[PDB]
Amino acid sequence: ILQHPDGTVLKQLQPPPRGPRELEFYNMVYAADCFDGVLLELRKYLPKYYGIWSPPTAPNDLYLKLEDVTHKFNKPCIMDVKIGQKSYDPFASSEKIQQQVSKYPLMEEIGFLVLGMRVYHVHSDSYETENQHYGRSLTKETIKDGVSRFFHNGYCLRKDAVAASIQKIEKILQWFENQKQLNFYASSLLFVYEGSGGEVEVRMIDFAHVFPSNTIDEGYVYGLKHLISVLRSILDN
């Protein structure tokens, strides 16, 4: 992810087949002749899509030009949460499934994984960052506190941001409960709130493993529900 001052990010396509698949996903959803009511509603929850981009002197070098979801914030606090029970897709090999499950074997049980967070602290004028190893360390015993960390500004728990996050996730959950045409593996929610009341972004990102389906994305729904339940419990701190 490269942040552009014009308020966009450039995401370089991952190697095949993942990068091409994410390109086709955006192309399908933001197709200018799409009157699919499911896909039209989905746009609300994605970064705005500005199409494929390449450098003027390098058409080989493929990027997606996406809305920077953090742009409108002064001191954005950002958390990426991978959603679902499985982060391997329907066409993974035994070896690939093993790789994905071993990365975080609690995915089936918990239904989400924190990929990282960046939290602005007021009383130090600085950022705390957590990497992939933070979220992969969390167990069922520590997931509530693991998530709570995101909402600590070094003086209070930002229950406004927690409440707002529940409300926005609920809308995404409603979308998933009214579609049976896409299943999403190893995709994420990007949470943003203002670190400098109730001003929040919750957006879906990372679509290298989205597949056509005939059924409810039961794994994604479980993840959303469990995440909402955790956030709800935090409101009682």
User: Which residue ranges make up the site for ligand YJB (CB under 6 A)?
Assistant: 1, 9, 11, 47, 66, 68-70, 78-80, 116-118, 190, 205-206
* DSSP helix/strand/coil, 82: strand
Q: How far is the CB of 182 from ligand YJB (least distance, A)?
A: 17
CA distance 207 to 24: 9
CA atoms within 13 A on the CB side of 141: 1
| Closest CB to ligand YJB among residues 3, 98 | 3
Check the annotation: does 209 bind a ligand: yes
- Other residues' Cβ atoms within 10 Å of the Cβ of residue 21: 17
CA distance 237 to 235: 6
CA distance 26 to 49: 7
Torsion of CA 161, 130, 218, 17, to 10 degrees: 130
Q: How far is the CB of 214 from ligand YJB (least distance, A)?
A: 26
Check the annotation: does 69 bind a ligand: yes
| Closest CB to ligand YJB among residues 4, 180 | 4
Q: How far is the CB of 38 from ligand YJB (least distance, A)?
A: 21
Check the annotation: does 65 bind a ligand: no
Q: How far is the CB of 35 from ligand YJB (least distance, A)?
A: 26
Annotated binding site for substrate: 18, 82, 96-103, 132, 209
